[PDB]
Design a protein around this ligand. Structure first.
Ligand SMILES: Nc1ncnc2c1ncn2[C@@H]1O[C@H](COP(=O)(O)OP(=O)(O)OP(=O)(O)O)[C@@H](O)[C@H]1O
Ligand SMILES: Nc1ncnc2c1ncn2[C@@H]1O[C@H](COP(=O)(O)OP(=O)(O)OP(=O)(O)O)[C@@H](O)[C@H]1O
Ligand SMILES: Nc1ncnc2c1ncn2[C@@H]1O[C@H](COP(=O)(O)OP(=O)(O)OP(=O)(O)O)[C@@H](O)[C@H]1O
Lengths: 311, 311, 311
DNA sequence: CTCCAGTACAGCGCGGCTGAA
DNA sequence: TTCAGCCGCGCTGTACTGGAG
């Protein structure tokens, strides 16, 4: 097996120009705030499985690894809101993640607001990264509860510290709900999936560098005329479903001692990771699926909106 | 009586290729997660009485018997959600099943989420098997309450541990409810009942190996021209109703000292376990039920959907 | 008076072949479950006043009298659900009936589920007999609330103990409501009333053995040409209305010192217990009610359904 | 004892069915 | 076909109950 080789296939990061744009703007957002005047506050959108959590994890490592190794400083944070969050819930989650208070027994919303304003300049917080902002949309109704948003404005004005709120595209309406919170978050970037297959696009060079990064020694056959077309046909732009297929195909080619990833175990990987794919979608690998013009259209505008459009 | 022989007739496991497919994928799901990166997360559908709980019990024994005998390690779990589950309810059920906390007095959903994230790497959890996923569908309305699904996504991202959620086929819409939870559960397998009678199929060899496994010494007469047609006519594919009929017929042949299972006590067993069978269905054993072409059609597509279609 | 003789007239049990069928199946249901594998789980239907409660009381005495006299063991139970039962209500009723916990102050549905799963193998429960299953049908609307049914499935799978749920025939739709609970209850028997008067049927020999069992010394005159026709004409099959008439007639013949039950006090007993009988029904005892062909028809199919058909 | 959340009952508004013009 | 009245369903407000501070 060699679980070292398996972990190498699973942990494969390839930097796209969109990710380098987000990382450059994140470094800019941090280094601009003097923690006296109002910070910059970016909002990053992005659909279900574009690689937002990978972007935050890549930034976390490249920013706070040596500083966290130095001592209890924790310069940048990573916060994942709970579903249907109250201000007290997201406040105490921000508290128990940041350093080591108890913080989650005494829930009174005011004294723990005083605690984390006492503690944010104490440890030396430089940035707050919130991952889930679509949790502030109520599930079955379409009201967006503005208590956490107003509390985020409150904690932003009280202690001037830049906040980079991530979320799905339909979380925009939560920023539309509060006009003051809308005005604060000026910088808005859309981390949207891969666009076209025509070739010599960002998708080809991405698969070229991922072909390089794969733990096979000789070639993996990606980013050619035939296989790129089949690959985009399987996974439209969704980075997770593409990486899942590539991961299952790699560990399949590792299991039965092979040269590389071939059109032997790729078909098996396609039939394995095609459960989540929609009703009308066709698997382009099986017996005789001539990959069509209609399969390779760019992803829509409302790609991450559909759950909001379902009600 | 010899309750040893009765327990032998009751505890009879025959491995079908569909069950071996599920077990191979379950072993694969476990041995792929390094518990740093995102796990694989299979979803196994299956109708009312296909042998899902038998699959989980067979896997539990063949995985965790010697490791549980070694000490308090509990590598794999078995969770059965309560009906109309809240995240706190399914969270504390996951807690009180896993090891020995108290965990079911202090219900605050946040500190017991912290407790089970503290405790999951502590004991060394390798896999979580959830049995009931159709409970998240509300009974009389058709809304699917997405609090437990969003909490399952939360606990999946917080502590990277593979979850194999079992459920009835109409629990698919609960996975369709959350687009992120849909994306996560890529591997989907359908454990569907037995297909055809025409003979030399999986049903014949299944009854051949179950004929072997029965505690009678000489023959039980199963998987021949006549009796296989009558057996499929009684129980379409439903593994439980077939096994119940075979069980009641076996213990009937054990009661009055007999050679084997014959067409003496099988008729009695048919009239015994025909209460649950639908209105238009005919018992093929009684006096003169010429077994027809129309009785031996394969089971439908929406076999485990009917309760969802009833409202 | 001699209240000994009065109690002898009131407490008269005559075993029919349908009752002996139910008792043989109950003994079978108990002695088959090894409390490791899935139990047998019979469902027994029956109209208003067929003698279900008498069957459970007869079984309770003949099973658990000496074992309850030995010590706190309580092998078999007797549960009567409350009307519009919640799982917590029927759960704590099951708890406070079984042994001696407190169990009915702390209502949280999860920890008392843990309590009775802790306690069922502790005392040594071999069988659970639930008497009222038609309470899960809502009164004025026709929805059947499936929380107690899903909890019964939960407690059946958690602690493998055979459950014999009794109820009225229109409670079948509650078993039709849950396809998993339908599957589980394979053995379904219909304890339906007495059928015909033509003579030399089960009704004649039943009145013959009840004539024997009555506390009069010489004869009671039952199960002859004339009186059997008048008896069926009064009470179609309803065991309770028949036994009530016989009871009132007996204690009338005991009051004024008489030879036996004659056509003197039987007429008075008929006019006494004819309040519940329907509008078009005629009392066949009064002055000149020539007992007709149209009176002596067998009871209908939907005998215990009428309250469901009323809405 | 007070505040927040969930459940049940009552009132108001909207949609569907029935009766009248 | 349109308007009005009655019934059913959904939303809102109100009171009662349970949990939490
Ligand atoms: N640049 C990249 N190169 C290779 N793989 C990548 C890259 N970016 C993301 N991935 C992979 O894409 C997958 C998506 O995971 P990730 O959680 O980051 O997506 P996400 O959008 O945050 O998901 P969600 O919206 O559900 O939180 C991961 O398996 C990750 O390894
Ligand atoms: N491979 C097998 N060989 C023999 N008997 C089997 C096999 N698989 C399942 N059974 C039998 O099928 C019956 C169904 O049990 P099980 O509870 O596993 O089904 P299920 O589909 O999980 O039911 P439910 O979905 O209601 O929980 C059991 O009596 C079991 O012994
Ligand atoms: N075999 C029998 N011989 C004589 N009397 C009988 C017999 N079976 C039942 N009875 C009498 O029939 C009457 C019916 O009472 P019982 O409560 O058993 O009926 P039931 O169907 O349970 O009523 P319910 O459905 O309302 O609970 C009792 O008075 C009982 O003594």
């Amino acid at each position: 097996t060699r679980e070292a080789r398996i972990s190498r296939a699973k942990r494969a990061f390839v930097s796209t120009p969109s990710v380098r744009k987000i990382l450059s703007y994140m470094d800019r957002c941090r280094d601009l705030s003097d923690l006296e005047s109002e910070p910059t506050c970016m909002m990053v959108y992005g659909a279900s499985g574009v690689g937002k959590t990978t972007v935050i994890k890549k930034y976390l490592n490249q920013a706070a690894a040596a500083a966290a190794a130095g001592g209890d400083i924790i310069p940048v944070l990573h916060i994942e809101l709970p579903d249907n969050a109250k201000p007290v819930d997201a406040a105490r989650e921000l508290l128990v993640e940041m350093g080591d208070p108890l913080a989650l027994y005494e829930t009174d919303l005011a004294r723990l607001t005083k605690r984390l304003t006492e503690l944010i300049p104490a440890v030396g917080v430089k940035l707050i990264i919130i991952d889930e902002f679509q949790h502030l949309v109520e599930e079955r109704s379409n009201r967006v509860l503005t208590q956490v948003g107003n509390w985020l404005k409150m904690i932003l004005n009280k202690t001037k510290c830049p906040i980079v709120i991530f979320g799905m595209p339909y979380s925009k309406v939560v920023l539309q709900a509060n006009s003051q919170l809308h005005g604060r978050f000026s910088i808005q970037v859309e981390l949207r999936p891969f666009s076209y297959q025509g070739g010599r696009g960002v998708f080809k060079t991405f698969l070229e560098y991922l072909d390089k990064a794969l733990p096979f020694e000789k070639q993996a056959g990606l980013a050619n005329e035939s296989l790129q077309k089949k690959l985009y046909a399987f996974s439209q732009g969704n980075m997770r479903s593409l990486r899942n297929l590539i991961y299952q195909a790699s560990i399949e080619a590792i299991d039965n001692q092979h040269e590389t990833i071939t059109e032997e175990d790729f078909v098996f990987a396609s039939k394995l990771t095609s459960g989540d794919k929609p009703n009308s979608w066709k698997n382009p690998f099986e017996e005789g699926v001539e990959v069509t013009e209609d399969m390779l259209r760019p992803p829509p505008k409302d790609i991450g909106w559909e759950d909001y459009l379902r009600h």
